[PDB]
Amino acid sequence: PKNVSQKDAEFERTYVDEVNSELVNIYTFNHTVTRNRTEGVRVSVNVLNKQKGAPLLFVVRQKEAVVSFQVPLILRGMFQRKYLYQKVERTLCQPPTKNESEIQFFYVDVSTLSPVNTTYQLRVSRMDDFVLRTGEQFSFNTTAAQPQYFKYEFPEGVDSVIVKVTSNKAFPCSVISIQDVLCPVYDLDNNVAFIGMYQTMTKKAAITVQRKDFPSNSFYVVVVVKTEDQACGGSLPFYPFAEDEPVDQGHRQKTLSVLVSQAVTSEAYVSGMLFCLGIFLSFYLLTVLLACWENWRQTIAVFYALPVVQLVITYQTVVNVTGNQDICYYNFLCAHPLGNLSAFNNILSNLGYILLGLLFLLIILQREINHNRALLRNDLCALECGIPKHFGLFYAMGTALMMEGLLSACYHVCPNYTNFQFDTSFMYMIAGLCMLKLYQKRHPDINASAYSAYACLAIVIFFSVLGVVFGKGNTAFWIVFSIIHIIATLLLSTQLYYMLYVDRMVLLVMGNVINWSLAAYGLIMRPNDFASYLLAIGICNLLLYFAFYIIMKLRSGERIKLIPLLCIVCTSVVWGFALFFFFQGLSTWQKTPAESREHNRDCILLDFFDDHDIWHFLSSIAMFGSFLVLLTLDDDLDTVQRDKIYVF
Amino acid sequence: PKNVSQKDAEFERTYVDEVNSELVNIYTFNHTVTRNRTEGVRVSVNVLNKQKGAPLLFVVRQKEAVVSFQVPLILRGMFQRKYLYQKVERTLCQPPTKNESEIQFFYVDVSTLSPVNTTYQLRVSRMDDFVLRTGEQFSFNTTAAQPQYFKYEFPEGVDSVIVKVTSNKAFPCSVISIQDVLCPVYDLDNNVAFIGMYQTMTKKAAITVQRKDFPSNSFYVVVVVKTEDQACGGSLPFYPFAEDEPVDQGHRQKTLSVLVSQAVTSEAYVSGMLFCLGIFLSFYLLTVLLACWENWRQTIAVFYALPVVQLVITYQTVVNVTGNQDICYYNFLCAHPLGNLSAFNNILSNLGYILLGLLFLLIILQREINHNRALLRNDLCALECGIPKHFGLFYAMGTALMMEGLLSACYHVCPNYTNFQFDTSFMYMIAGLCMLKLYQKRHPDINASAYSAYACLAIVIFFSVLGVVFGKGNTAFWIVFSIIHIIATLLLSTQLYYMLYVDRMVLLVMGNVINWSLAAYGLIMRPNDFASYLLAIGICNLLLYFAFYIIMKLRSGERIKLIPLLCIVCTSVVWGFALFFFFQGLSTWQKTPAESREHNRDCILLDFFDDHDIWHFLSSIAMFGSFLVLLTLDDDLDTVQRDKIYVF
Numbered sequence A, B: 001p002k003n004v005s006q007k008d009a010e011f012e013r014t015y016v017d018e019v020n021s022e023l024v025n026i027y028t029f030n031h032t033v034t035r036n037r038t039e040g041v042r043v044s045v046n047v048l049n050k051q052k053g054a055p056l057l058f059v060v061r062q063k064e065a066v067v068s069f070q071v072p073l074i075l076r077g078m079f080q081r082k083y084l085y086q087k088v089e090r091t092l093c094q095p096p097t098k099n100e101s102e103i104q105f106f107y108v109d110v111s112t113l114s115p116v117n118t119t120y121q122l123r124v125s126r127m128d129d130f131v132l133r134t135g136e137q138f139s140f141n142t143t144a145a146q147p148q149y150f151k152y153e154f155p156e157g158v159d160s161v162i163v164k165v166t167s168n169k170a171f172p173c174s175v176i177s178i179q180d181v182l183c184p185v186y187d188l189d190n191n192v193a194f195i196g197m198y199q200t201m202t203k204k205a206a207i208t209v210q211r212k213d214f215p216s217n218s219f220y221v222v223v224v225v226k227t228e229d230q231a232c233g234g235s236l237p238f239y240p241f242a243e244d245e246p247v248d249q250g251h252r253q254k255t256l257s258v259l260v261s262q263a264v265t266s267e268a269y270v271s272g273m274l275f276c277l278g279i280f281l282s283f284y285l286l287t288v289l290l291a292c293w294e295n296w297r298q299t300i301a302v303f304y305a306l307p308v309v310q311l312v313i314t315y316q317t318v319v320n321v322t323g324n325q326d327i328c329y330y331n332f333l334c335a336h337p338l339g340n341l342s343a344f345n346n347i348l349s350n351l352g353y354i355l356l357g358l359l360f361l362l363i364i365l366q367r368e369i370n371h372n373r374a375l376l377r378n379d380l381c382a383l384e385c386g387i388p389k390h391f392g393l394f395y396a397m398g399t400a401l402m403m404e405g406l407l408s409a410c411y412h413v414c415p416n417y418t419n420f421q422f423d424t425s426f427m428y429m430i431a432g433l434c435m436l437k438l439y440q441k442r443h444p445d446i447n448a449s450a451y452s453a454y455a456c457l458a459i460v461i462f463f464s465v466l467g468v469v470f471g472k473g474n475t476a477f478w479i480v481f482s483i484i485h486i487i488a489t490l491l492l493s494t495q496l497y498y499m500l501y502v503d504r505m506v507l508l509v510m511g512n513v514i515n516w517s518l519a520a521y522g523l524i525m526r527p528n529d530f531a532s533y534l535l536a537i538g539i540c541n542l543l544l545y546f547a548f549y550i551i552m553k554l555r556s557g558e559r560i561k562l563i564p565l566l567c568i569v570c571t572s573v574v575w576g577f578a579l580f581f582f583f584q585g586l587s588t589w590q591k592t593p594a595e596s597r598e599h600n601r602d603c604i605l606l607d608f609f610d611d612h613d614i615w616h617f618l619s620s621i622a623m624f625g626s627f628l629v630l631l632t633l634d635d636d637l638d639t640v641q642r643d644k645i646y647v648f
């Protein structure tokens, strides 16, 4: 009936043969495999002339598996789009060997149903690059039709490694997958996401793996290039080739470099543990040293937090079980896993807010007890002299700091677009509290009927959510928000003229100029999130009001003391550092995960903490400093009779 | 070299042939295909004696596709577990035909690498059951090794159909997938979730599809049986066969029945629209008729809502784009899509709370205006007679009803385990408000320093979240919660003895008995969520306090008027109906999605609204009634001087 040509073929040679409906070509390949060196093989097939009617069918038959594909290989698109690839390459799947040395045979089948003759080239090339080694970078080319996977074996004494792959050009989109060594290997667009840890990639992709997951002490690093870039977030093709005719691709190639490096040891966990406690417990012993010197000488939070916890549990469990690392916007280069937490470093860094808020609450309680005891002594200075001492708002600030730490840690177990508000929101409220804490301090009577906290929180939370949800700037909602910032600056000027002096006038004048300068950034439209900017503008406005109050106090003749000045300088320095690290942070939740991975950076401090972690440490130190400045700013006034002159 | 036997084979015959390393068997099948009748074919292969060394390799070659599998077919498990299936069946993928009548050939390749002879049976059977028809149920058997998919063509004039598949036994787990007719078909465990709408199934699985999605006016109903039941939530195998030896399966078969029925027309959308407005606008004209008769005769919500909206947008978009219907716990039998909302009926039913809360707010505003005008008249009865009129808490109840409607609609766009609190929570707060609204009404002086709302809300929200999050009852946290309910009943008795009369004593006595009866359900512990029970216990306790207050009023000699009595009877009837529908609701968020689909039920009213929707309509009517009873309960007292006797 049909003539079949069973021919013996050497390994590394390009075989150009003709096949039609009558002919079937059989290739027999014999190779020697060894347990010590794995060395997987790669089958390359190219169809020189395109057969529109019937594709050429290739079958690769091994001892324990069969891989079959059709060339030209037609792949799916997002909207009924077919992409045609005339070169297909696949690495053959090699099962583990029981003996020491084998002589294994695998047969390649070539056949077609098209009556006309079609020519092809078939070359099976041995891969000496199959095994990956620690600290060695391999650059290779892969295409949607040619997927490449490599094997890494765990060196003795290594319990976890990170698989980082970098590309010079963002596109085409790709999916790096880490799979156990149990054959077959899922290196196709349809089954790549079936098992293992996978994440889309444009320029960077880092996956941490551990020996406990893989009993065989080895894994496969499978890289599959997506046909379309929409998942990576780049662009959506809308033209290509119309209707049934498949688009011709294959000119799109992705060049990558896999580097498998040993993950940080348990020493970094201990050193990070000690650094976190050591810095903030230094403040604890410092204030006890400060206290001992003096003695010898003389609901909204809970409502905010519950959905946070629910989202935490569900999302972290989903990421752990499914392996879809695209869900959480971690810093995969610096994310360090402990138990079920993929990013322990961020949560650990969030301990600064908690500890410093607790310490500030203790300081407030001590001051309140001392003031109450002084009142019990019926001292005239405590009763009727100095700025009215109100500790409850200070308690609110301390509780706000502690709960900001809690909420930000709960957010940072899995930073994700569905949680961006949870980090930045309490920070603006604490700033919004430090805002008008001074105003209440100088004008306690105005605070009697203030009714401002709920309004401020509602305003900021409304502003910081729907604008992001609806869009990222429709050329430009963020320019509209810059106009809103301008009218807010006008409202600040309106508050100014309601408040008297030429120096005050000019001070708020360059305050408005500073706000507009910031509004320019709010132009070239807020590339990041308002969430970050609201905190930034709020903190900048808070520092401006700080300076306003200080210049007021110096102008009125009230002299700032040594402790307020030292706290002021420390707060400024630390605020500046915090701002620098806050500014360095960019992207994250707003961008797509593949585009978000591009900005990821390695660890900076102690091989454990990233830039954001440093921001958490610094912010808490700065905010503690701000609270302390507020606590001690009017100390000079307290030691003297209440001012006869009307309040500023 | 090797002897290949190209033999011509008829279609429906069991071919028993022997194959070894030397032999390769070639089968040529010729069949006639037509455009009007699709008629896809099915290839069955069974390997009689198991070959431990080398599996038997089968290749099916068609004009435009090649399907190749190995028998025995080894499939993956959750934890390095291999399941061996000795019978593999696959339907061949048929591309669309350009001519009218074709004579298409497809070749089946059988080969192995094992030196020893192995026997097999190969039978290719024509499927006259490929095409699905509306209203016709097909019962078929499928296995993890044998996946079955069927084609449904849209009849002219039908724009949407629902694909419902039912099984008599829950297990094994399965994945029904709906895919477009563009070949190949992804009927394997690894690639089934690649495209289309898929959902796991134990007993029921309903998928709504629309003509706009599929330009070809047809789709493939792919059913794949999972090897393990953990995703369906049943059990986790921990024994089976140890180490490398693959477990032998194939005794596990799933029997299903696919019924494709035409979805509800646009008439149900209009009728559901009219019924929703018609019922609640009847209350609007009724109270205007009531008002005209008299005239002629004479922040926590916003904080709760923002994460809700964010979760809405992300989850609904994810379900729409990925096709993973397991995420949202819809009522897929009664979920009716409108635009991007998969379940429009629930959101539409949630209009009752909004409209009735707005109407109650208008009634409160009218009463407040009338009372203020009467005070302006300096009437002694308004100034110093009757129960003190406090409209602000009534405003709180009305706003709570409106926001409960809003939040419950936002929840019901995608009911899901990460949103269960959002529906039930405001309802207990409204009940917790109706709780002690009467107490404030009789004892306004106690409410001056109450400070109870925040405490009650914190208690209920704490109770209703962490208990569910940590577990579903560890034999049993819900028995522990029943003990908590017992101590709460003891606290209620403590409140009783603080309050005087033997009748009051006995009344709270069977009130405690009723609570304990409810606690027994809290036993055979909470198959249901506490969330449902807290609402139920709260509403039952609220009705108990209602009856307590009414019996008090009748005992003191104060006669209830006609309107309060009619409102009381209507509220009871409607509360009873609401409770019945609330009780019928079960499962949902707590159980796994495959187990949740088992309890799904078809639409009851107007072919548009389910039982839960009826609960939304009834609850709002009952709660409006409760508010009205509270508003008019003391009307008799108002028309007379303030009671000299001390308040109850």
Ligand SMILES: *[C@@H]1O[C@H](CO)[C@@H](O[C@@H]2O[C@H](CO)[C@@H](O)[C@H](O)[C@H]2NC(C)=O)[C@H](O)[C@H]1NC(C)=O
Pocket: A008, A010, A030, A103
């Ligand atoms: C592998 O297959 C062939 C024949 O079984 C042999 O490989 C070469 O084949 C051609 C002759 O057909 C020549 O290049 C050489 O004479 C063969 N040997 C080598 C080393 O090139 C070879 O005999 C087979 N190898 C094994 C291990 O069976």
Ligand SMILES: *[C@@H]1O[C@H](CO)[C@@H](O[C@@H]2O[C@H](CO)[C@@H](O)[C@H](O)[C@H]2NC(C)=O)[C@H](O)[C@H]1NC(C)=O
Pocket: A139, A140, A141, A253, A255
């Ligand atoms: C990946 O593809 C690029 C693009 O073709 C290769 O770069 C070319 O390599 C050929 C080698 O024959 C050179 O002649 C060209 O000058 C190169 N073009 C450049 C560098 O722009 C690259 O070699 C490929 N990498 C691998 C590992 O095959």
Ligand SMILES: *[C@@H]1O[C@H](CO)[C@@H](O[C@@H]2O[C@H](CO)[C@@H](O)[C@H](O)[C@H]2NC(C)=O)[C@H](O)[C@H]1NC(C)=O
Pocket: B008, B010, B030, B103
């Ligand atoms: C299909 O293939 C075979 C041979 O090409 C034919 O089908 C039958 O084959 C055997 C003889 O080898 C006998 O059962 C009959 O003589 C054949 N015909 C029928 C109808 O059974 C048949 O000729 C081929 N059909 C077509 C349309 O090409």
Ligand SMILES: *[C@@H]1O[C@H](CO)[C@@H](O[C@@H]2O[C@H](CO)[C@@H](O)[C@H](O)[C@H]2NC(C)=O)[C@H](O)[C@H]1NC(C)=O
Pocket: B139, B140, B141, B253, B255
């Ligand atoms: C699905 O599998 C069941 C279980 O084997 C089949 O039920 C049996 O069918 C055979 C037919 O040869 C009967 O002899 C048995 O008595 C049946 N056992 C029962 C009903 O318990 C069922 O027929 C299969 N369905 C299909 C469509 O093949």
Ligand SMILES: *[C@@H]1O[C@H](CO)[C@@H](O)[C@H](O)[C@H]1NC(C)=O
Pocket: A003, A004, A005
């Ligand atoms: C038979 O097939 C082989 C394959 O090359 C070869 O001998 C020849 O092409 C064929 N002989 C015929 C068709 O007579």
Ligand SMILES: *[C@@H]1O[C@H](CO)[C@@H](O)[C@H](O)[C@H]1NC(C)=O
Pocket: A099, A100
């Ligand atoms: C290797 O496999 C062959 C094939 O059966 C067997 O004869 C031989 O004993 C094996 N080698 C060892 C060391 O067991």
Ligand SMILES: *[C@@H]1O[C@H](CO)[C@@H](O)[C@H](O)[C@H]1NC(C)=O
Pocket: B003, B004, B005
């Ligand atoms: C050649 O293969 C065919 C297949 O059945 C048959 O003629 C015979 O088994 C073989 N002849 C030999 C091995 O001499």
Ligand SMILES: *[C@@H]1O[C@H](CO)[C@@H](O)[C@H](O)[C@H]1NC(C)=O
Pocket: B099, B100
């Ligand atoms: C059917 O296909 C054959 C094969 O080329 C062709 O000759 C014939 O014209 C086609 N029929 C029609 C109606 O076009």
Ligand SMILES: [Zn+2]
Pocket: A408, A412, A423, A612, A616
């Ligand atoms: Zn943070």
Ligand SMILES: [Zn+2]
Pocket: B408, B412, B423, B612, B616
């Ligand atoms: Zn509901």
